[PDB]
Design a protein around this ligand. Structure first.
Ligand SMILES: CCCCCCCCCCCCCCCCCC(=O)OC[C@H](COP(=O)([O-])OCC(O)COP(=O)([O-])OC[C@@H](COC(=O)CCCCCCCCCCCCCCCCC)OC(=O)CCCCCCCCCCCCCCCCC)OC(=O)CCCCCCCCCCCCCCCCC
Ligand SMILES: CCCCCCCCCCCCCCCCCC(=O)OC[C@H](COP(=O)(O)OCCN)OC(=O)CCCCCCCCCCCCCCCCC
Ligand SMILES: CCCCCCCCCCCCCCCCCC(=O)OC[C@H](COP(=O)(O)OCCN)OC(=O)CCCCCCCCCCCCCCCCC
Ligand SMILES: CCCCCCCCCCCCCCCCCC(=O)OC[C@H](COP(=O)(O)OCCN)OC(=O)CCCCCCCCCCCCCCCCC
Ligand SMILES: CCCCCCCCCCCCCCCCCC(=O)OC[C@H](COP(=O)(O)OCCN)OC(=O)CCCCCCCCCCCCCCCCC
Ligand SMILES: CCCCCCCCCCCCCCCCCC(=O)OC[C@H](COP(=O)(O)OCCN)OC(=O)CCCCCCCCCCCCCCCCC
Ligand SMILES: Nc1ncnc2c1ncn2[C@@H]1O[C@H](COP(=O)(O)OP(=O)(O)O)[C@@H](O)[C@H]1O
Lengths: 344, 47, 98, 52, 459, 120, 97, 39, 319
């Protein structure tokens, strides 16, 4: 990429979420969403492999129709209130549209089909951006409008996502898609507490970002899109085997690690609000997510899969190092739990 | 030694001085902040 | 078949080091890994520990209660009071639902 | 003497720190210092703390 | 209680920083002394229990265990110096640290005031244990065993998480001290009848009940000796400690919500005891012995009579020490024999004279010989169970007859009979093997002299 | 939640009102934890990059232990404020709307009659 | 507008039903997609015009400017597809299964 | 002793585009490692 | 380091290329005298002459450069290749797979020198001319069909990324010639190479390799007589016009990414270790772990270059 183009695109992919967050005029929030859609598509097809064009053409159609639905909500509001922004008075259907639409861009629940497929055809790098710096934008729009959205729908999309994400993940063996599925799940918890305590959504996101960003830079350190590929981690780079183990169990909710806090406080907030029906079912299938996380643990760490002689060759050569971010985001993530009170 | 001279054969002396020097600026600001802080706290409240 | 190692036999550590104590193969580490384990294990835990535990005084007050009973039984019997009256919290204190 | 005995001093030191941290727990939880009912007494002569 | 804990943490730095050759002795010697500091908690000298600080407390029920948890780390590290002596010098220092963290975590769990501190630390102990079982497990099936050990505990765990957050909202703090001195009386609704099950089920799972105990036979089979000692001696008892402190609340329901478990346990005690009678794997038989002798405990922590509780406290500490002793000697036969089969290796006393004395005393502890805390324990649970219903003696009476039979069969077909003709010649006994045993039984003899210390909260 | 409060500083980290609160003691266990959390990050890095774990980057080790800690004092300083605002806000309401949070009289057990379920 | 804003809205839903049920050529979706932008542009312009809200007329056009590029990106993906598969037919787009 | 490290066959299962292969799903084949197809 | 930053500020391969700067490989049969022609062509244009890839070429490449023990270098013997064809353990396929990895490292090291220095490179045989040995081996009982597929999969995954040889100087000497040439430098192993196998190597050269690279790159063939006359061959190279081929589109902003690839050896052969479990290739966990603990413990290897004190590295406490 002519480095100039790289700058323009990257600026847009970054001006995209930032305009959304900063503005209050919904319109300006919509174009922030629009710029993110335009900026991400070029990077998605960088290899320009036949799989890639498929990825982008799906991502784009799914993103575009949702963008149009979000605009329709703003256009309708404009006629039910002269304001260009959702208010207490807003017709309920107007808000529900925004939930469905925004739940498509974020890819939650019954609209979770595009994400796993686009996460499969894009590079590991652009995978991260597509999973974590593109969720900030829509979520911002929701978090702003939380007082007004429906508790019922969110919960249904929340629970569905948790289930779909978990069930989908169990079968998958491609890593990119295992992560895509996890993101659907975590995204679910996040949207469950939005109606009740938005501030916790912003924790269940950061922690997801501080967990997923190290996890993916791990997958690419050896650029392994297969579990079999990550399983030979012990030969290619032995040290990351320890933290890859804890980060994945952290992604699932197991108690000593940082990953428990988001689930724990979301459950505490939902029980405070009396959803002890919903919270219970979510926590239970949340346990399904750890099963596929630990199955990967087995292959990568607890058991040593057989490797190839040609690997001895890759050991010889100095391994290009993992950026510092890996460490700082691996530790702050695997073990901050002793510092939970200040996080929330 | 090494056929391909290690890139790390001799320290990046800039990386030392911005790593060492940065940390010593952190402390001198941090310790300053605390005593300065204590004061304001003490006087802000009765003492 | 893939390349893999032939089964490793387990050595008769008692063939060399005929004084093997079971801790490590080279002899001096073994000796110094039992001279410190029998000692810290038996000599100052089973002995000093049992000494201290034996001398914990009147554990959970059961050495105190066999006297307090004796002066209560001494006092209650001589003054003619019932040795264990039948209500503990006095009836007067209780405000039964009327 | 720190030549492989600075290793041997790691745990012994943990005990010391432990007791310190522990005796700095008492100092905090010192309300009802002597204000408990079963054990309230007038500070005997030359005693400023019933339990330290 | 930060001397039983901070000095413990520092063990981790010592296992790592220390020389590869001297790593074993620094760690084992120091934790023996760590146990000596643990003995200070036993100095009660008064009814008021010891609240060290806000988060850390030790009452009669926890104190007898914290000392056992600190005691076994030395022993665990002495029983695994053989296997795990074939490793790369960084696999060892990981195993040693894993064992160290278990008692750090277990010491805190047994010494925790806030019930959810119990939960976080409670369910954390699975991480160290699963690594010990899966990473170093000899058999092809440990991946499976690990899954069983993680899911049975985890599916039970999330209900307890919901329940404890639930009581915090209902009462306003999960502090065991307050919860005790506050009025939390459930109201026998249909919902409460569920709360009770939510709180007890997670504890009932790791304390193998007849219905959910399949995890323990599978786990101890392929687990390394140190993991099997930890699971039997401290890990299973985590479930019992939890049931004692959690049933302070949910006071009214267990009067009638316990029948299901009580009957599950007493019939379970008979069947688990009996299948021990014909099981070819020795580690298998000890594990089911552990299920049955732990089925007695869930039937005393539910009858809830003073004697039951301390019968339970007596038996849990006692059976913990005895089971390990049995699992430790089973390993010594396994390492020389190279097979878990009970039928092979017949006649060992002829070739290992003393280990057989340790085998005999371990079996007599396993069955209820009378001048032992093991018998005092069962005698007491038996008494209360009889009080609950005189008929209970029949079922707790078929278990005693069966328990005698399998305990002696382990001695009769492993340590007597004609010697096996020529298995790989059985090298003589190491002094470590014998001490690891002596260290288990010498405390069993000393505790039996003064049973008062392990009697529980009730008495 | 706490946003929308009167006087809210729209983008500020810790409003000066937080001066009134005591400063976090530099050795607060938490800041000390952040320190250890940091040292470990450093050590971990060395490990993943295959360097002598402890004897390398002794300059970095310092940057880490000293970056994390620096961050702590100024974060905790805030989180401490946020919690302190929460009380100001909470306690105030209890009063301004007193009737809704009325003081209750608890009858001495003598009076109250909780039923006794016998264990037998 | 009371019923003139229901025709446009249903136009957007009829265009919605279109983009969501594909059939062969991808162009027909994109084209459909655009049918919505026209309906949104018409509705935004209509209400702005009968609310005399001139401060908002900027929007009716910003909507079109962003929609045009959006479509530009969409068509470049389309051209990319009938360069890799010789057709715009969606069935071809089933490799990511 | 050789704690059983996984053999080739244990490894095999984790290959294939889906772990628990379905009736028709199994018919699929793993995605190309290069992320580029032959068609 | 080389990165966009450097590229952004100058450091363009565009400014470092000259007529003599090309990737020229010379390929022949087991004994085509290509070794000699190579050195000379190199001497002519100052081209860095890379030696044919070897079992321990990677070890000479990395760290100390002393030859590694056989098991550390993948346990491959060309010697055993010959004395035991169709071996039970498959040393021949393992030899071929390690050879492909070695030339992948050599070709990538060559491209890194070409784009950085600007000097050209003569690489003798290349990844592009490795398949002839495997084709002949499968034509013979040496390798089975799947073994072939596994090599082809590795070749398809890694070879396309690297740019093609500019020209591919070629020698030819009929099988009788080579066999005879073998007799002159006597080596028990090299000597016992069934002719038909040599027949299959050259064939795969002429039938498949020679034409295939003729479109994408300048193939100039030189009979033995033209050979041994480096001057003439060198002359002809200086004569051919480097036009036809994919190299024409390599703009600076395109080279940068290729450079950053070869600059990273761990990636060059990333797909060489793909988890395809054919039995010959598999290390095996217990054997592989041991070989690793032992290769990683060699002096200067236990830590990254610059940080291991054994070989005399210093300043580790500040690095
Ligand atoms: C060891 C390093 C020692 C360095 C010493 C440096 C000098 C120094 O610190 O001394 C002065 C300083 C003086 O302290 P102080 O004010 O006198 O302490 C009195 C407080 O009452 C005593 O402090 P406190 O307990 O009242 O402090 C409040 C709070 C303070 O909170 C904390 O600091 C948490 C620290 C946790 C460790 O307490 C808690 O820790 C509550 C959380 C308890 C644990 C909750 C999580 C349990 C499950 C997860 C366990 C960790 C899992 C990690 C992930 C998995 C990793 C594999 O000492 C310290 O504060 C440091 C003590 C040790 C800190 C932890 C070190 C490990
Ligand atoms: C809250 C407690 C939670 C549980 C704590 C204890 C478990 C921690 C999590 C362990 C998870 C991974 C388990 C399996 C790891 C397998 C690692 C392995 O097989 O060995 C290879 C690996 C890399 O080797 P390498 O370091 O490159 O070799 C150097 C040679 N000169 O070798 C290594 O990686 C060596 C370095 C490993 C990292 C050090 C781990 C030490 C143990 C951590 C204990 C933490 C205790 C915390 C207690 C909290 C109490 C509240
Ligand atoms: C397997 C091991 C055993 C698992 C047992 C699970 C039991 C259900 C989950 C935990 C139930 C529980 O927490 O009990 C109390 C809870 C609320 O009861 P209550 O305090 O009456 O509040 C309702 C309004 N009064 O009552 C409930 O939460 C009942 C919830 C029923 C449905 C929860 C989802 C079940 C999924 C299976
Ligand atoms: C595996 C088993 C090993 C051997 C176990 C032997 C003891 C089992 C005891 C179980 C029952 C204990 C008592 C339970 C309550 C029975 C009813 C009762 O209240 O006891 C009083 C009863 C005498 O009452 P009476 O008015 O004379 O009329 C006779 C029928 N009740 O007196 C009774 O009828 C008590 C009931 C029987 C108690 C003695 C049992 C003797 C068993 C002899 C061998 C039987 C086969 C073994
Ligand atoms: C100033 C030092 C003295 C005081 C220290 C006080 C620490 C108290 C709290 C301890 C917390 C538990 C973890 C302690 C880990 C100590 C690691 C260490 O000291 O480093 C040396 C050790 C050497 O072993 P090795 O990895 O083989 O390196 C040799 C050269 N290649 O290298 C290692 O093994 C690194 C292991 C890192 C483990 C990190 C665990 C984090 C949680 C799990 C992930
Ligand atoms: C709410 C509805 C829920 C439906 C749930 C079940 C959906 C099942 C769909 C598959 C049913 C079985 C196969 C049917 C195949 C078929 O003929 O219809 C698909 C239809 C035409 O698309 P085509 O790709 O040409 O497929 C034709 C294949 N014979 O596909 C299309 O129609 C593509 C969309 C363009 C045409 C319709 C656009 C909407 C028009 C609405 C006009 C008003 C209708 C009022 C009634
Ligand atoms: N990919 C390969 N597979 C098997 N053998 C190979 C391969 N590449 C080279 N060789 C062997 O290396 C030997 C030496 O080649 P070469 O250097 O051309 O011989 P010389 O040095 O005599 O010119 C040849 O006999 C050839 O069989």
């Amino acid at each position: 990429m002519n480095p100039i183009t790289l700058a323009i695109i990257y600026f847009t992919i970054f001006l995209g979420p930032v305009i959304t967050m900063s503005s209050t005029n919904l319109m300006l929030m919509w174009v922030g969403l629009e710029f993110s859609l335009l900026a991400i598509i070029p990077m998605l097809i960088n290899k320009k492999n036949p799989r890639s064009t498929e990825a982008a053409t799906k991502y784009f159609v799914t993103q575009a129709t949702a963008s149009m639905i979000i605009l329709l909500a703003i256009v309708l509001n404009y006629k039910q209130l002269g304001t260009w922004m959702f208010q207490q008075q807003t017709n309920g259907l107007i808000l529900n549209m925004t939930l469905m639409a925004l739940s498509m861009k974020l890819g939650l629940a019954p609209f979770h089909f595009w994400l796993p497929e686009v996460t499969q055809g894009i590079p590991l790098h652009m995978g991260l951006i597509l999973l974590t710096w593109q969720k900030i934008a829509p979520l911002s729009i929701l978090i702003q409008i939380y007082p007004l959205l429906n508790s019922t729908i969110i919960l249904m999309l929340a629970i569905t996502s948790i289930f779909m994400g978990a069930w989908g993940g169990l079968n998958q063996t491609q890593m990119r898609k295992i992560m895509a599925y996890s993101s659907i799940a975590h995204m679910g918890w996040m949207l469950a507490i939005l109606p009740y305590n938005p501030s916790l959504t912003l924790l269940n996101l950061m922690i997801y970002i501080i967990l997923t960003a190290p996890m993916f830079m791990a997958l690419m350190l050896n650029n392994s899109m297969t579990i079999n590929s990550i399983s030979l981690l012990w030969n290619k780079t032995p040290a990351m085997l320890t933290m890859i183990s804890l980060m994945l169990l952290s992604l699932g909710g197991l108690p000593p690690l940082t990953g428990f806090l988001p689930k724990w406080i979301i459950i505490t907030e939902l029980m405070k609000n009396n959803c002890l029906i919903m919270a219970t079912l979510m926590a239970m299938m949340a346990l399904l997510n750890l099963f596929f996380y630990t199955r990967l643990i087995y292959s990568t760490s607890l058991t040593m899969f057989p490797t190839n002689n040609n690997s001895k060759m890759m050991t010889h050569q100095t391994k290009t190092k993992p950026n510092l971010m890996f460490s700082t985001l691996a530790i702050m993530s695997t073990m901050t739990l002793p510092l939970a009170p200040q996080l929330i | 030694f090494y056929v391909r001279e290690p890139v790390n054969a001799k320290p990046n002396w800039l990386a030392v001085g911005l790593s060492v020097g940065a940390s010593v600026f952190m402390w001198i600001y941090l310790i300053q902040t605390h005593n300065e802080d204590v004061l304001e706290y003490k006087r802000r409240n009765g003492l | 078949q893939w390349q893999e190692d032939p089964e490793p036999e387990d050595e008769n550590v008692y063939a060399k080091n005929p004084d093997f104590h079971g801790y490590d193969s080279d002899p001096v580490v073994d000796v110094w890994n039992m001279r410190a384990v029998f000692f810290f294990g038996f000599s100052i835990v089973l002995v000093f520990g049992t000494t201290f535990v034996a001398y914990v005084p009147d554990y959970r007050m059961q050495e105190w209660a066999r006297r307090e009973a004796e002066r209560l039984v001494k006092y209650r019997e001589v003054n003619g009071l019932p040795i264990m009256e039948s209500n503990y919290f006095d009836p007067s204190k209780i405000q039964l639902p009327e | 003497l720190l030549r492989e005995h600075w290793v041997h001093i790691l745990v012994p030191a943990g005990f010391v720190f432990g007791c310190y941290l522990d005796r700095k727990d008492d100092e905090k939880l010192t309300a009802f210092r002597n204000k408990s009912m079963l054990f309230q007494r007038e500070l005997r002569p030359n005693e400023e703390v019933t339990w330290k | 209680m930060l001397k039983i804990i901070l000095p413990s943490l520092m063990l981790l730095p010592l296992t790592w920083l220390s020389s590869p050759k001297k790593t074993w002795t620094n760690v084992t010697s120091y934790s023996f002394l760590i146990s000596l500091t643990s003995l200070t908690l036993l100095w009660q000298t008064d009814e008021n229990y010891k609240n060290f600080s806000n988060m850390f407390s030790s009452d009669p029920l926890s104190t007898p265990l914290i000392i056992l948890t600190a005691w076994l780390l030395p022993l665990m590290l002495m029983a695994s110096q053989n296997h795990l002596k074939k490793d790369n010098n960084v696999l060892q220092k990981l195993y040693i640290s894993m064992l160290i963290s278990l008692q750090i975590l277990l010491i805190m769990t047994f010494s925790a005031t806030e019930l959810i501190m119990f939960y976080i630390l409670f369910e954390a102990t699975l991480i160290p244990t699963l690594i010990i079982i899966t990473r170093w497990g000899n058999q092809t099936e440990r991946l499976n065993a690990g899954i069983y050990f993680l899911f049975y505990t985890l599916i039970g765990s999330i209900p307890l998480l919901i329940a404890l957050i639930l009581i915090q909202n209902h009462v306003g703090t999960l502090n065991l001290m307050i919860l005790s001195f506050t009025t939390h009386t459930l109201d026998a609704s249909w919902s409460n009848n569920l709360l009770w099950l939510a709180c007890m089920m997670a504890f009932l799972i790791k304390m193998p009940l007849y219905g959910v105990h399949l995890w323990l036979p599978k786990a101890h089979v392929e687990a390394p000796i140190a993991g099997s000692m930890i699971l039997a001696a401290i890990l299973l008892k985590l479930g019992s400690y939890g049931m004692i402190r959690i049933s302070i609340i949910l006071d009214p329901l267990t009067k009638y919500m316990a029948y299901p478990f009580i009957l599950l346990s007493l019939w379970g005690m008979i069947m688990t005891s009996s299948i021990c009678l014909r099981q070819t794997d020795l580690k298998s038989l000890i594990a089911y012995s552990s299920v049955s002798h732990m089925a007695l405990v869930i039937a005393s922590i539910m009858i809830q009579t003073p004697w039951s509780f301390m019968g339970a406290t007596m038996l849990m500490i006692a059976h913990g020490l005895t089971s390990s002793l049995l699992f430790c000697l089973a390993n010594s036969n396994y390492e020389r024999i190279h097979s878990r089969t009970m039928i092979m290796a017949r006649g060992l006393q002829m070739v290992f004279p003393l280990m057989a004395t340790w085998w005999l005393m371990a079996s007599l502890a396993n069955l209820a010989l009378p001048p032992s805390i093991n018998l005092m324990g069962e005698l007491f649970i038996t008494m209360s169970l009889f009080s609950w219903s005189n008929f209970t003696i029949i079922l707790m009476g078929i278990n005693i007859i069966i328990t005698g039979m399998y305990s002696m069969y382990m001695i009769i077909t492993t340590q007597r009979g004609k010697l096996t003709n020529h298995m790989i010649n059985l090298q003589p006994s190491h002094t470590r093997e014998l001490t690891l045993m002596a260290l288990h039984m010498i405390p069993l003899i000393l505790l039996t002299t003064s049973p008062k210390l392990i009697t529980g909260l009730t008495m | 939640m706490m946003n929308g409060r009167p006087g809210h500083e729209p983008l500020k980290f810790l409003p000066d009102e937080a001066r009134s609160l005591p400063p976090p003691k530099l050795n607060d266990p938490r800041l000390v934890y952040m320190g250890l959390l940091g040292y470990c990050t450093g050590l971990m890095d060395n490990m993943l990059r295959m360097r002598p774990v402890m004897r390398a980057g002794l300059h970095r080790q310092l940057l880490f232990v000293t970056s994390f800690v620096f961050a702590g004092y100024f974060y905790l300083k805030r989180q401490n404020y946020l919690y302190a605002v929460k009380d100001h806000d909470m306690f105030g309401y209890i009063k301004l709307h007193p009737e809704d949070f009325p003081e209750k009289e608890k009858k001495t057990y003598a009076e109250i009659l909780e039923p006794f379920h016998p264990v037998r | 507008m009371p019923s003139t804003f229901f025709n446009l809205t249903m136009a957007f839903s009829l265009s919605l039903l279109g983009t969501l049920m594909f059939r062969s050529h991808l162009m027909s979706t994109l084209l459909c997609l655009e049918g919505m932008v026209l309906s949104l542009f018409i509705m935004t312009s209509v209400t702005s015009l009968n609310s005399n809200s001139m401060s908002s007329m900027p929007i009716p056009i910003t909507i079109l400017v962003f929609a045009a590029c959006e479509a530009a990106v969409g068509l470049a993906l389309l051209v990319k597809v009938s360069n890799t598969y010789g057709t715009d037919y969606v069935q071809n787009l089933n490799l990511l299964q | 002793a050789r704690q059983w490290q996984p053999d080739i066959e244990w490894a095999e299962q984790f290959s294939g585009a889906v772990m628990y292969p379905s009736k028709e799903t199994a018919h699929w084949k793993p995605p190309p490692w290069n992320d580029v197809d032959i068609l | 380091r080389y990165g966009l930053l450097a590229a952004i500020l100058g450091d363009k391969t565009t400014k470092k290329l000259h007529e003599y700067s090309r990737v020229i490989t010379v390929d022949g049969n087991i004994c085509s005298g290509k070794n000699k022609l190579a050195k000379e062509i190199a001497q002519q244009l100052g081209m860095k002459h890379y030696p044919e890839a070897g079992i321990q070429y990677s070890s000479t490449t990395t760290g100390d450069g002393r030859p590694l023990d056989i098991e550390f270098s993948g346990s491959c013997s060309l010697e055993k290749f010959y004395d035991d064809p169709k071996s039970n353990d498959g040393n021949s396929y393992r030899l071929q797979s390690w050879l492909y990895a070695s030339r992948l490292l050599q070709y990538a090291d060559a491209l890194e020198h070409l784009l950085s220095t600007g000097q050209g490179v003569v690489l003798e045989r290349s990844i592009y001319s490795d398949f002839v040995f495997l084709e002949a081996m499968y034509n013979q009982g040496y390798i089975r069909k799947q073994c072939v597929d596994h090599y082809n999969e590795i070749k398809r995954l890694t070879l396309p990324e690297y740019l093609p040889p500019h020209a591919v100087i070629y020698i030819d000497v009929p099988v009788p010639e080579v066999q005879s040439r073998i007799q002159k430098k006597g080596d028990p192993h090299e000597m016992k190479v069934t002719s038909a196998y040599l027949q299959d190597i050259e064939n795969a050269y002429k039938k498949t390799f020679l034409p295939k690279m003729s479109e994408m790159c300048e193939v100039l063939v030189y009979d033995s007589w033209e050979a041994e006359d480096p001057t003439k061959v060198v002359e002809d190279i200086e004569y051919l016009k480097y036009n036809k081929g994919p190299w024409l589109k390599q703009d600076d902003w395109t080279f940068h990414y290729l450079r950053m690839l070869v600059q990273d050896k761990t990636e060059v052969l990333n797909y060489t270790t793909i988890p395809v479990y054919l039995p010959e290739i598999t290390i095996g966990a217990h054997q592989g772990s041991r070989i690793y603990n032992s290769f990683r413990e060699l002096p200067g290897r236990k830590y990254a270059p610059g940080y291991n004190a054994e070989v005399g590295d210093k300043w580790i406490w500040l690095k």
